[PDB]
Design a protein around this ligand. Structure first.
Ligand code: 3HF
Ligand code: 3HF
Lengths: 387, 387
């Protein structure tokens, strides 16, 4: 799938996007890849943060569905006007699809200045599409209309350091492989966890460790009220009780150096003299995921190089600065971009499962690496899902 | 080397021993395998803790050297009379060696009640032999007088639970392979560290981690005043300053449970309800060793299953009990039997190097194993050796 390798750009703090064309003649637009939603939507009117937008009047193939749409996310919201049009992915499969598009006319805290994207590709299922599940999501339209296999995979590549505006524009941010799996994008074995339900890409976490030490909570707490894989969110997000336990444990493991509460709240930077970030004092985090095989599970292990998010030192120093990229959630677990950056993630819709492998572009040091390991057969399991 | 596999019995707390015969006709004795000394010595007079001893007057091949010898160890001492005799290892190479033998006539806190051994095989070099370096150690005599390659390897197998008298006699304690390497005794790769100087089996430790966290001391402190591989000592022994830093870090990592001072002093047991030992709260310990290749190193990693030594309860019960098998040293680092139990150790005298690989018989759990891993290149390791 060489043609699709390196087709993504961006970073965890602002999102990863793919180039698309909409309309006739083709209007080129950069589109955020979002596994956490199901609407395909584009800026359709001038906006301070957009350098371009969808011009419906200029497309001969535009079809007006004569219907409004409102989409509130956990963060940000927009409203628009529904329609269909011809859509392609220049560095995806050689196909053109007629797909639903929400033309965004109003928005609040949705578009991000300097992110270089103008729309969003919701890759999850119809169940969570707005206004309702009759609005067929882009990926469903793609599979139905073409011969593309019903799956995709994502390699999100974090740099491990801050990238400026021109650097983000000039670098490869990863790969979206539409209709397949590329073996150059990972190392070792691909382990699969079942998609619990086809709405979000929902999964079940059966155990959590901090440096090998069991959080020791009822596994239901890890999936309260769901656990999702979500490329349109920066952080790992955890239910209140899990978050407090994880933070307490991470503070304890890294207790040789003390940090502001603002840091653990994910808002304040911590900085170290150039090169001196003490990675070794911060623990690894293992999330155990339900296996395909009964009574079986595997684990994914992430480093502080994943959960400490590199940010710019704007001061007159050469310091290396980071934000704590774990946050509290009131809507269940969210495995956001900083986690996905550790792994090659296969969204095997056909077989209703999600694959994880160590990413060929994950950030690490010579002492530790991210890992995907199994099987584990002694885990108290079965009822870890929430109802 | 099928004939030599499973030729050891014993336990870390009392020592691992091999069967030998001395004299003509052969007198069968059990002999402690000791990489930490260089004198071959046997009980040669009645002692409360010996069920058998060397009777020189019944050996037609006995030669009396008319010279006394006194050997003080870190713990225990003995005095005896020097001579030579024919020696064999029934479950070793098919050879007969004429070797020096100290006939022990007086001892103090050396022989161990219920250990089932009656002498000691010092496997280290002449430099540390008593009365002096002209008393050729057994292994040297073996190599000189036979075609046996100048190499031996040890797999010490800890049970992971306590062994009563009956069990330890009926249980296999591991393997001493004389003249080679058995590939069935380890998994993964064998990694080699240089023998710094042929006296003890002296090595150089460049870095110490507790759960991936650097102890952060100058590497000289790890090797003050030497670091040795020593099967004739139960515990990992550490220089005062390293021991204090290690214990503080082990305490911190395991702080969810609190233990008496006497536990950390290695003096008193801690007990848990049967099967509930919380392995996961205790950290792993990695020791990085100097590689053969310049500015390159590797690491060996042990579990609490190695550094917590299983012991019988003082008030017999079904509880699982352990002592902390790490002690303070004033004579440098000692990699004792509890460390060696994690690994297949190759004493490659011919190439002046020691090989480590994960032991096929090491105690672990479903979540963690002992490891031998490398290479590592970012480590500053210049004056790590002490002079
Ligand atoms: C790409 C990373 C950019 C950084 N960013 C935005 C800026 C924050 C200052 C950020 O990290 N966050 C992005 C969040 C978020 O809500 N993202 C949604 C998509 C999106 C992408 C880009 C911008 C806005 C939104 C996603 O679809 C929700 N999935 C579950 C869901 C929930 C409800 C309805 C629904 O369906 C209609 C699906 C978010 C949440 C909490 C904290 C930080 C968050
Ligand atoms: C299998 C161990 C059973 C338990 N045991 C004994 C009972 C403790 C109360 C125990 O753990 N310890 C055994 C120690 C020890 O000194 N062992 C020597 C051999 C031996 C085997 C069996 C019995 C006694 C002795 C070894 O040769 C020293 N090497 C360096 C060295 C030093 C000096 C001279 C020298 O050469 C002339 C070599 C020891 C030391 C400190 C703590 C615990 C120790």
């Amino acid at each position: 799938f060489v043609e699709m390798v390196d087709n993504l750009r961006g970073k965890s703090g602002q999102g990863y996007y793919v180039e698309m064309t909409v309309g006739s003649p083709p209007q080129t637009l950069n589109i955020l890849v979002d596994t956490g939603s199901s609407n395909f939507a584009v800026g359709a009117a001038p906006h301070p943060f957009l350098h371009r937008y969808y011009q419906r009047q200029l497309s001969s193939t535009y079809r007006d569905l004569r219907k409004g749409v409102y989409v509130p996310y956990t963060q940000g919201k927009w409203e628009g006007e529904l329609g269909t049009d011809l859509v392609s992915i220049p560095h995806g499969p050689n196909v053109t699809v007629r797909a639903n598009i929400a033309a965004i006319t109003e928005s609040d805290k949705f578009f991000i200045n300097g992110s270089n994207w103008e729309g969003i590709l919701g890759l999850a299922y119809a169940e969570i599409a707005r206004p309702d599940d009759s609005l067929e999501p882009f990926f469903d339209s793609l599979v139905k209309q073409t011969h593309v296999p019903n799956l995709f995979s994502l390699q999100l590549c974090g740099a491990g350091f801050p990238l400026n505006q021109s650097e983000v524009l000039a670098s490869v941010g990863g790969s979206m492989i539409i209709g397949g799996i590329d073996h150059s994008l990972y190392t070792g074995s691909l382990w699969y966890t079942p998609i619990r339900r086809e709405w979000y890409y929902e999964v079940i976490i059966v155990r959590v460790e901090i440096n090998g030490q069991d959080l020791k909570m009822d596994c239901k707490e890890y999936n309260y009220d769901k656990s999702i894989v979500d490329s349109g969110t920066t952080n790992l997000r955890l239910p209140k009780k899990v978050f407090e336990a994880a933070v307490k444990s991470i503070k304890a493991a890294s207790s040789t150096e003390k940090f502001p509460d603002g840091f653990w709240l994910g808002e304040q930077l911590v900085c170290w003299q150039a090169g001196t970030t003490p990675w070794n004092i911060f623990p690894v985090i293992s999330l155990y995921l339900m296996g395909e095989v009964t009574n079986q599970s595997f684990r994914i292990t992430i480093l502080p190089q994943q959960y400490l998010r590199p940010v710019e030192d704007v001061a007159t120093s050469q310091d290396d600065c980071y934000k704590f990229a774990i946050s509290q959630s009131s809507t269940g677990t969210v495995m956001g971009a900083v986690i996905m950056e550790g792994f090659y993630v296969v969204f095997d819709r056909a077989r209703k499962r999600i694959g994880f492998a160590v990413s060929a572009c994950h950030v690490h040091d010579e002492f530790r690496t991210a890992a995907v390991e199994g099987p584990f057969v002694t885990l108290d399991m079965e009822d870890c899902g929430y109802n």
